[PDB]
Design a protein around this ligand. Structure first.
Ligand SMILES: *Cc1cc2c(cc1C)nc1c(=O)[nH]c(=O)nc-1n2C[C@H](O)[C@H](O)[C@H](O)COP(=O)(O)OP(=O)(O)OC[C@H]1O[C@@H](n2cnc3c(N)ncnc32)[C@H](O)[C@@H]1O
Ligand SMILES: C/C=C/CC/C=C/CC/C=C/CCCCCCC(=O)OC[C@H](COP(=O)(O)OCCN)OC(=O)CCCCCCC/C=C/C/C=C/CCC
Ligand code: HEM
Ligand SMILES: CC(C)Oc1cccc(NC(=O)c2ccccc2C(F)(F)F)c1
Ligand code: SF4
Ligand code: F3S
Ligand code: FES
Lengths: 153, 129, 613, 249
């Protein structure tokens, strides 16, 4: 059920709640830094994507108005192409980064590359690499669409 | 002064005795190994889904995703949803949630695969506008 | 004001949780004795953790060695104020007690044959002086001390002790010259605690904070010897303060003697490797009294270094960068942090600093506290024991040998527990407490708590430190002393005019430092009056007005038919200050130095000689 | 002259249900020392002696003075005072600990956990104590490097947002690295039930591989690496056996 230390540890909390000491400040005062932010963003994107998948999967199922007529309930509004691949980027990234960062964390789980430079490059290599495969997947298919609406010789 | 009560020891953890009763065998080791490997094997998949499509992809994509997310939220839920903050019987509630969640996520996707556009195509069917 | 007081009973109670603190706490817990360890900080934080160059044992891991050679180096090192018998028990049990520590979990640095790495140090030799520089100092490279305290603490967790973490030992508890336990303020909630115990062990560390610049920790305020003085014990040999040669010029935190035995040296303004002249044979690896002196002469005779020409250089840059990392990583580093110095390319600014306190609570080889009257030898204070820095079995004499200190800690630690099993016999029950015992210890606490004079506690500590710094330093004069002594007694006076601000019990940092300020003053004064009276130069105590070592004979000449000077005329005797704690009068008195070993068949006693290096 | 301004967490438990506050303190840096602890010592020995914080060693080797300065966790005694007198260096206690008083947190949970790893050499075939040193190759003693040095200061753990949330079950980086410190000791025979101990969901595995632990260590150690390395053992990488004690030992 619980290792003995875990038993003892609970007793501690109760004992400290008993003495009404205040809990020292922690998140509001900890220096913003790459280590916990990228860890943040990983969880954030994680949940958000599962979030959508639930409220979208379940959403369209127990709801009258299906998905094909959603694609219409939008395009028929006067949708600026600029803001349309701001939207498609906002989607590619959380997938691209979570996957990229993901492989990274498995690095950490098996002790590979935990020195502060690998820690700090990983974060930069994975962030930019997300935005690259996120950009060149939104703007790349907008070359078999906005080149075939103008093109020279 | 000369009015003193008799005192007990300080709360202190006993590494020997209080660690020779309790011993229960159940390893979460073995199991962690699998949730990593799956998440790993799940790499080619996300690339491959950007290309190959259809009911077949839809299926395993939204079947594996259910599992990855099932584990994930569990992890999350287990972190924040802590008894010292919610009292024992609310913490139990949220832990059930993480499975209720995991159930609807499946149902939801499995419907949307069989009955709406499917997954893979529901992305084509956005990435063009 | 109103106070909560608390009572426990133990078989033995230990004040101190350092090297000797625990090693004895180990034996006693394991021997099935109900043990309480009272410590005024989490035991890891203790000073032992700060130790460096290693711990000595004749392990033979670099060259053949004999515990007996080590012995000899210890008698010599002590300039024969050392108790031959006490030094014996130390030198003999060394190889075991170090070995033991390995067995315990201590990750010693290692030799290619998988044995414990030993390294040279200050003032040791093979074959009773004859042979070359010795290699006896076993070490966890550069942070031995850190690892010793950490193993001990760990290994103590399986020996059933009741640990009383951050509790402040106010006073010993007396009854007709027999210690029945201890009284401490609990730091956390603010209670007061009385421990009835059958024996009590004092292992509180030293008082290196009585000086202005030292290598000791802020908690090294010498509190045990305070309790000892307060309990009506004399202290021994207080005047022998050991000046470490190599302390960082600015702050004064230690750079190991290791850096020397590893192949480094001191350098002056010219560039001269000067130690060659002040000691031809053992050079930069002479005893730390000789060397710290040499430095101070070089300094004062002009050849100092840097902006004020007031310290010398410890040059390590001439040494292979590899072995400099794999053998000195922490000093390498604390040199970069504090001196802002790269050790591979420049030297470290170093200056002798107050280090270790040979002096302390007197004992026999059995590590039992003694009161000595001239009429009836040393009689033992019932059920009181002391070990480590704060004791004076005098194993160190006039000058503690480098790295005999963690040995002394562990060995006599071990000794306490061994010796208490043999003498406490469990028919003897846990003593009752004299009608309201140490109600006055609790009193003196109220007085300092609500202290309201004109002079802050901060302020008193500083001049007492500074005056000690001038008037009691490396080289001293009969007047420059007398002159400190006066300024000094004037402070024990100024104690009434004490000023604090904090009125709380729950972790009163201020309140406790002021209790410490009290405890130091006792040590200080005593030190200086003990020093003021010794008219000879010996080990770490060097009078310009009496350069000679004042032995019975003059050991410069044959000895055949020379009349033995009487006890009252020569200086081979332990100083023994008896301080009345409320006025602060100090009477002296002088105990003979013990010259017989433990068994003259095992090792024969070592007779005095002219102490050169 | 140079007025540095420090902003310090303050709490009096004796004040009848008081609350936390910050309190500004001004310090002339040429009449002061060079490291934060100096400036604390100073502003308690000159301005306000009701300022309370642990310390001892003055060269960052005891562990006492660990607190949160300038946003991250470190040792007051060895981090430099920020000489830019326009900025304002702000000092809190180890994040998310229960505060006895001022800059003093309650450490006891963290001390318990440490003693739960059973941090002592334990051997399979009991040996006679003082008798002889056990064999250990120099290269396998080196496996303890970056492991033994830990001053048990709790900077890491108190930066770890998992130890924040579940310190009662989650063991935290400090203790964890040390639990590991003992398993890879070639001299240690319990390697097997040493892992067996932290075999469950929280104690070891609630490390979300976040990296404040490695990134904050004032001793430039790296517990993340060792937590990771433990994972490897709770599964699929077994610990090397003891090379054989050669003859003449
Ligand atoms: C200062 C120093 C000393 C030192 C050294 C390096 C430095 C910087 N390197 C050494 C070395 O390389 N080799 C060696 O042999 N010695 C070295 N030394 C000297 C040696 O470390 C010390 O002398 C040794 O640690 C002595 O051990 P001991 O156990 O006697 O001293 P301690 O470790 O400081 O113990 C302190 C304990 O006493 C408790 N205490 C004190 N007063 C109280 C009160 N009033 N109430 C409760 N507890 C008290 C402390 O709490 C602590 O637990
Ligand atoms: C905050 C907002 C949060 C949003 C959450 C949203 C939904 C998340 C669901 C996750 C499932 C993703 C898998 C789907 C997929 O790749 O789509 C294929 C589609 C078919 O293309 P198509 O345009 O029809 O293509 C056909 C043209 N022939 O592709 C897409 O357009 C979707 C983009 C794919 C993501 C980028 C891939 C990144 C790769 C990571 C790299 C690592 C390996 C090493
Ligand atoms: C190859 C692709 C993926 C990889 C390699 C991967 C990897 C990981 C890993 C290693 C974790 C655990 C973090 C930890 O506990 O230390 C995690 C957590 C999580 N994942 Fe993914 N994942 C992938 C795809 C996805 C996708 C597409 C989603 C969205 C549906 C997702 C949702 C989540 C959630 C909600 C968590 C919660 C755990 C946490 O935040 O710590 N994952 N993922
Ligand atoms: C200010 C920084 C240091 O602190 C922040 C504060 C808020 C929570 C977090 N980060 C998490 O909470 C987090 C993120 C990803 C995975 C696991 C966690 C977990 F387990 F819960 F620790 C970090
Ligand atoms: S690894 Fe470093 S940060 Fe962590 S407890 Fe040890 S000394 Fe502190
Ligand atoms: S920050 Fe926490 S997640 Fe593990 S990597 Fe360090 S203990
Ligand atoms: S005071 Fe020694 S660790 Fe900071």
């Amino acid at each position: 059920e619980k290792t003995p230390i875990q038993v003892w540890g609970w007793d501690y909390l109760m004992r400290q709640r008993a003495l009404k000491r205040p809990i020292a400040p922690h998140l509001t005062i900890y220096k913003p830094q790459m280590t916990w932010m990228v860890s943040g963003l990983h969880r954030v994107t994680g949940c958000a994507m599962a979030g959508t998948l639930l409220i979208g999967g379940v959403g369209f199922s127990v709801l009258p108005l299906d998905f094909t007529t959603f694609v219409e309930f939008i395009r028929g509004l006067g949708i600026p192409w600029v803001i349309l691949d701001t939207f498609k980027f906002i989607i590619a990234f959380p997938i691209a980064f979570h996957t990229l960062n993901g492989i990274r964390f498995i690095g950490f789980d098996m002790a590979k590359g935990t020195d502060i430079p690998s820690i700090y490059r990983g974060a930069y290599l994975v962030l930019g690499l997300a935005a690259l495969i996120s950009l060149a997947v939104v703007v790349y298919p907008r070359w078999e669409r906005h080149k075939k609406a103008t093109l020279p010789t | 002064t000369s009015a003193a009560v008799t005192g007990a020891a300080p709360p202190q953890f006993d590494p020997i005795a209080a660690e020779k009763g309790f011993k229960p065998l159940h390893s979460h080791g073995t199991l962690f190994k699998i949730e990593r490997y799956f998440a790993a094997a799940m790499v080619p998949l996300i690339p491959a889904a950007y290309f190959i499509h259809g009911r077949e992809m839809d299926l395993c994509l939204a079947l594996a995703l259910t599992l990855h997310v099932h584990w994930g939220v569990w992890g999350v839920v287990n972190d924040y949803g802590r008894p010292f903050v919610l009292g024992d019987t609310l913490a139990a509630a949220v832990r059930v949630g993480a499975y209720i969640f995991t159930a609807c996520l499946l149902a939801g996707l499995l419907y949307f695969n069989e009955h709406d556009v499917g997954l893979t195509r529901a992305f084509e069917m956005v990435w063009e506008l | 004001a109103q106070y909560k007081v608390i009572d426990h009973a133990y078989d033995v109670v230990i004040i101190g949780a350092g090297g000797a603190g625990l090693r004895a706490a180990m034996g006693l817990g394991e021997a099935g004795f109900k043990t309480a360890v009272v410590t005024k900080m989490f035991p890891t934080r203790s000073h032992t953790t700060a130790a460096q160059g290693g711990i000595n044992a004749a392990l033979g891991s670099m060259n053949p060695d004999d515990w007996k050679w080590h012995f000899y180096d210890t008698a010599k090192g002590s300039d024969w104020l050392g108790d031959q018998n006490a030094m014996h028990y130390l030198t003999r049990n060394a190889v075991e007690a170090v070995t033991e520590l390995e067995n315990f979990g201590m990750p010693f640095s290692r030799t290619p044959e998988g044995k414990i790495y030993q390294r040279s140090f200050g003032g040791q030799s093979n074959n009773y002086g004859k042979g070359g520089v010795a290699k006896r100092t076993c070490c966890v490279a550069d942070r031995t001390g850190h690892s010793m305290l950490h193993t001990l603490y760990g290994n103590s967790l399986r020996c059933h002790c009741t640990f009383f973490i951050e509790y402040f030992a106010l006073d010993l508890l007396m009854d007709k010259g027999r210690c029945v336990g201890v009284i401490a303020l609990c730091l956390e909630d603010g209670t007061i605690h009385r421990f009835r115990s059958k024996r009590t062990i004092v292992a509180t560390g030293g008082y290196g904070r009585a000086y202005f610049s030292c290598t000791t920790a802020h908690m090294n305020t010498g509190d045990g010897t305070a309790l000892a003085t307060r309990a009506g014990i004399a202290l021994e040999d207080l005047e022998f303060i050991q000046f470490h040669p190599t302390g960082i010029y600015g702050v004064g935190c230690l750079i190991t003697e290791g850096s020397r035995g590893e192949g480094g040296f001191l350098v002056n303004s010219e560039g001269e490797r000067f130690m060659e002249r002040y000691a031809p044979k053992a050079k930069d690896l002479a005893s730390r009294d000789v060397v710290s002196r040499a430095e101070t002469i070089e300094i004062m005779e002009g050849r100092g270094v840097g902006p004020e020409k007031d310290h010398i250089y410890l040059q390590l840059h001439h040494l292979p960068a590899e072995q400099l990392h794999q053998r000195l990583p922490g000093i390498s580093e604390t040199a970069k942090i504090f001196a802002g110095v790269d050790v591979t390319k420049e030297p470290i600014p170093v200056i002798p600093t107050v280090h270790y306190n040979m002096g302390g609570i007197p004992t026999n080889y059995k590590a039992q506290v003694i009161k000595y009257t001239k009429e009836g030898g040393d009689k033992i204070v019932p059920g009181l024991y002391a070990c480590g820095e704060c004791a004076c079995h005098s194993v160190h004499g006039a000058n503690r040998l480098g790295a005999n200190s963690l040995l002394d800690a562990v060995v006599f630690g071990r000794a306490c527990s061994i010796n208490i099993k043999e003498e406490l016999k469990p028919d003897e029950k846990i003593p009752e407490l004299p009608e309201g015992a140490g109600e006055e210890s609790i009193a003196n606490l109220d007085a300092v708590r609500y202290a309201n004079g004109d002079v802050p506690t901060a302020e008193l500590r500083l001049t007492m430190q500074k005056t000690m710094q001038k008037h009691a330093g490396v080289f001293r004069r009969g007047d420059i002393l007398a002159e400190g002594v006066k300024k000094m007694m004037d402070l024990s006076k100024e104690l009434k005019r004490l000023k604090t601000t904090d009125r709380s019990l729950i972790w009163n940092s201020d309140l406790t430092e002021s209790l410490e300020l009290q405890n130091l003053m006792l040590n200080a004064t005593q030190t200086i009056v003990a020093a003021e009276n010794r008219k000879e130069s010996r080990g770490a105590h060097a009078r310009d007005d009496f350069p000679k070592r004042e032995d019975e004979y003059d050991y410069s000449k044959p000895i055949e038919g020379q009349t033995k000077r009487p006890f009252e005329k020569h200086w081979r005797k332990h100083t023994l200050t008896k301080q009345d704690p409320r006025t602060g009068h100090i009477t002296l008195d002088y105990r003979p130095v013990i010259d017989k070993t433990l068994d003259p068949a095992e090792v024969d006693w070592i007779p005095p000689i002219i102490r050169s290096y | 002259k140079r007025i540095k301004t420090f902003e310090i967490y303050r709490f009096n438990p004796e004040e009848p249900g008081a609350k936390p506050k910050l309190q500004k303190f001004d310090v002339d840096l040429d009449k002061c020392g060079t490291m934060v602890l100096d400036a604390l010592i100073k502003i308690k020995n000159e301005v306000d002696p009701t300022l309370t914080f642990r310390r001892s060693c003055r060269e960052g080797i005891c562990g006492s003075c660990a607190m949160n300065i300038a946003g991250e966790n470190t040792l007051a005694c060895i981090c430099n005072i920020d000489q830019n007198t326009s900025k304002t260096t702000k000092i809190y206690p180890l994040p998310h600990m229960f505060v006895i008083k001022d800059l003093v947190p309650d450490m006891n949970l963290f001390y318990a956990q440490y003693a739960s790893i059973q941090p002592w050499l334990q051997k399979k075939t009991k040996i006679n104590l003082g008798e002889k040193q056990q064999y250990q190759s120099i290269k396998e003693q080196e496996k303890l490097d970056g492991l033994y040095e830990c001053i048990l200061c709790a900077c890491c753990s108190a930066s770890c947002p998992s130890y924040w949330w579940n310190a009662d079950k989650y063991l935290g980086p400090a203790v964890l690295m040390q639990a590991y410190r003992w398993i890879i000791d070639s001299r240690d025979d319990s390697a097997a039930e040493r892992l067996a101990r932290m075999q469950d969901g929280f104690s070891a595995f609630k490390c979300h591989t976040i990296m404040n632990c490695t990134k904050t260590c004032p001793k430039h150690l790296n517990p993340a690496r060792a937590i990771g390395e433990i994972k490897m053992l709770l599964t699929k990488m077994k610990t090397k056996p003891a090379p054989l004690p050669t003859p003449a030992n």
